[PDB]
Scaffold this active site. Structure first.
Site, PDB file in Angstrom:
ATOM      1  N   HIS A   1      10.575  21.186  26.476  1.00  9.00           N
ATOM      2  CA  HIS A   1       9.768  19.845  26.888  1.00  9.00           C
ATOM      3  C   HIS A   1       9.226  19.394  25.650  1.00  9.00           C
ATOM      4  CE1 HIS A   1       9.800  21.423  31.489  1.00  9.00           C
ATOM      5  NE2 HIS A   1      10.747  20.948  31.259  1.00  9.00           N
TER       6      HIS A   1
ATOM      7  N   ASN B   1       6.106  24.967  27.780  1.00  6.22           N
ATOM      8  CA  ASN B   1       4.598  24.601  27.205  1.00  6.22           C
ATOM      9  C   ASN B   1       4.952  23.672  26.157  1.00  6.22           C
ATOM     10  OD1 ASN B   1       3.552  26.136  29.297  1.00  6.22           O
ATOM     11  ND2 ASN B   1       3.347  27.956  27.834  1.00  6.22           N
TER      12      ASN B   1
ATOM     13  N   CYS C   1       4.787   4.345  13.153  1.00  6.91           N
ATOM     14  CA  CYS C   1       5.666   5.102  12.178  1.00  6.91           C
ATOM     15  C   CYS C   1       5.201   4.699  10.613  1.00  6.91           C
ATOM     16  CB  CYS C   1       6.848   4.621  12.638  1.00  6.91           C
ATOM     17  SG  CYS C   1       8.412   5.497  11.513  1.00  6.91           S
TER      18      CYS C   1
HETATM   19 ZN   LIG Z   1      10.067   4.263  12.877  1.00  2.00          ZN
END
Ligand SMILES: [Zn+2]
Length: 269
Positions: free
Chosen positions: A125, A108, A174
């Protein structure tokens, strides 16, 4: 070659077991209101979840895939652990005080085991609430709602909803200085291997365990579908907790039918 439905007999193994591995899948969270992959909950717009959770999907249409992941993050916002998650967590704490190990190996990505208080958790996962930068590779926790401003009010699941078509510049990026790479969910997609370190950790657990539970999983996705069978092949009792039979049922020592929110509190008491 066929499983027992005797709880009393399973309980005799449970009383002596020193190293329990509990494998879970989406069925453990069904009673929390979290959709499964099987059945009607496994569709988003006109797609199946295994259509979208792929590197090709992401390469082709990262906005669409991010709208899908956004929707799942938002679904999760209201969800809480159920009695099955709680029984698992309490079991680990109680047995730990006796020097007995319980470990949860979950498929999960929903973090509900965490929320219930499981400590010995392997998220094989990944997690819905982590990101990984496709430029820098950094992994970060991310619980922001919405994860980026362009996804605000997006992600609706009904078929015929227009693609948001968010330019890649406006998808989650990011925030490390000078990177600004496109983020992806830090999940394992279909067609991507598991992390080697994770495979090693699983391997150690399965090889050492003396009792295994296989809870709420359809036992169709690999390698995870291999895990409980391997333990059974060693001669270790495996108990399946599921509302139905699966391809794996007949490999195991025990099959306990019904909702795991009902059966696990009884089993793990
Ligand atoms: Zn980055």
């Amino acid at each position: 070659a066929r499983p027992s439905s005797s709880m009393a007999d399973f309980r005799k193994f449970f009383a002596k077991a020193k190293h329990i591995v509990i494998i879970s899948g989406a069925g453990v969270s069904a009673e929390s209101g979290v959709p499964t992959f099987r059945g009607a909950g496994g569709y988003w717009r006109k797609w199946q979840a295994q259509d979208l959770a792929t590197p090709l999907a992401f390469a082709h249409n990262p906005s669409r895939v991010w709208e899908f992941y956004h929707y799942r993050r938002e679904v999760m916002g209201s969800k809480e652990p159920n009695a099955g998650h709680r029984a698992i967590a309490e079991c680990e704490t109680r047995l730990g005080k006796q020097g007995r190990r319980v470990v949860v190996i979950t498929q999960n990505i929903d973090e509900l085991h965490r929320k219930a208080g499981t400590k010995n958790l392997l998220e094989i996962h990944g997690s819905l609430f982590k990101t990984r930068c496709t430029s820098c590779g950094v992994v970060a926790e991310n619980y922001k709602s919405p994860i980026c401003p362009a996804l605000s009010g997006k992600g609706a699941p009904e078929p015929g909803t227009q693609d948001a078509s968010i330019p890649v510049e406006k998808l989650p990026r990011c925030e490390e200085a000078g990177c600004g790479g496109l983020l992806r969910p830090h999940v394992v997609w279909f067609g991507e291997n598991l992390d080697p370190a994770i495979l090693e950790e699983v391997d150690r657990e399965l090889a050492h365990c003396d009792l295994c539970l296989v809870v709420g999983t359809s036992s169709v996705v690999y390698p995870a579908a291999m895990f409980a069978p391997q333990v059974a092949a060693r001669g270790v009792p495996v108990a399946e907790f599921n509302t139905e039979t699966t391809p794996a049922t007949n490999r195991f020592r025990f099959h306990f039918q019904g909702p795991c929110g009902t059966t696990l509190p009884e089993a793990l008491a």
